[PDB]
Amino acid sequence: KVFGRCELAAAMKRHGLDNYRGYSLGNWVCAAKFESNFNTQATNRNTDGSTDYGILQINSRWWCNDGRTPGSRNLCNIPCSALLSSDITASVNCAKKIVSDGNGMNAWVAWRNRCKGTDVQAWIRGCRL
């Protein structure tokens, strides 16, 4: 599923991401835009053989099981395919574990490079929340 900007913002807010660990909604929407272009089905392979999955590009190296990343962990305790669902619940719940691990949203390369330090409230502007 390819979310609209405001549609995703509302789904994220409903799932408890607004101000989660102090990150305003616009941060999450911005991250998703540059990680996946709002597409729940996005996949990308990394050099080390791990794969990033779904709207927040969660890495199989640490967070989910895809059966093809030897010596990896499954800290979210889910199959990586669950992160590709039209229902964002699994991605959000895993993102909550990631962002609490000490490094905040810096875990998301695109967020660090393209959202951090910008006017992220522009990403929810106009939306009915």
101 marked ligand binding residue: yes
Q: In what order do the strands lie in the sheet with 43-45?
A: 43-45, 51-53, 58-59
| Residue ranges in 68-87 that form contacts with Na ion under rule CB under 5 A | 72, 74
How many residues sit close enough to Na ion to count as binding (CB under 5 A)? 3
Question: Per the residue annotation, which of 52, 66, 87, 119 is the catalytic one?
Answer: 52
- Residue 104 interacts with, from Na ion, Cl ion, none (CB under 5-8 Å by kind): Cl ion
Strands 51-53 and 43-45, sheet pairing: antiparallel
Structure tokens at 25: 């909604």
The site for Cl ion (CB under 5 A) is made up of 104
CA atoms within 13 A on the CB side of 115: 25
Token pair in block for residue 9: 């913002």
Query: Can residue 65 be called a binding residue for Na ion (CB under 5 A)?
Result: yes
CB of 88 to Cl ion, least distance (A): 22
- The reply on whether position 50 binds Na ion by CB under 5 A is no
Based on the residue annotation, tell me whether 18 is a catalytic residue of this protein.
Answer: no
φ/ψ of 58, rounded to 5, equals -80, 135
- Active-site residue list: 35, 52
Which positions lie near Na ion, rule CB under 5 A?
65, 72, 74
